[PDB]
Amino acid sequence: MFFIKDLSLNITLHPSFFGPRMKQYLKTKLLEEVEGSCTGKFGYILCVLDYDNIDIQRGRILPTDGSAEFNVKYRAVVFKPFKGEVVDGTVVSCSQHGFEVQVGPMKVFVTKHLMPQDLTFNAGSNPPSYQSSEDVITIKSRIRVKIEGCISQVSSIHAIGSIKEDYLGAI
Amino acid sequence: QSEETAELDDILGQMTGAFDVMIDEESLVKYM
């Protein structure tokens, strides 16, 4: 799910950037260190809103490092997954263990046990697929997945998906 | 070796310590 979250960061600036345009460098650091990053506490951070209106407090010089620590408050759109949520995505990889669905910046794993009994794994077909008398699942196919669990690390997030329940599967 | 050189409590290898040193954005834009 996508949220507009008010986040704060502690940036460090090397002494080589102490000039009239120091604020510009801090904005670049925020755009290069925040955007595209994954944080378990808040989830993926996609975009930073109000680029011009970023508030920067006075920097503090570290004793033995010489760099300045800047606390930057900004508004950014984030994607934090949750178990029990229903999301849509496209299958990107397949194997005996299970196929993976691309939900935004996250990859959902559908284990062989979680998928219905009817689905069977066949690798003779190129590419490999999960086939059921009704439908067939393969790369680039759109699948509706239910997140059954999420493990959020400080710098990474992984989740598992299930299509056992009704109204979940090929779209 | 460096250019620079049940009760609650405040040996930890930590610190000039009386006063901190901050950077000034108002002055940086003016010096140049």
Partner: peptide
Amino acid sequence: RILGTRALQISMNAPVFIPLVIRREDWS
């Protein structure tokens, strides 16, 4: 600490024009 702070900053390839304020109340 300002003298050592700027000395380290200069040694780390910092431009030379001391834009620092002592956070005792902040004073420049």
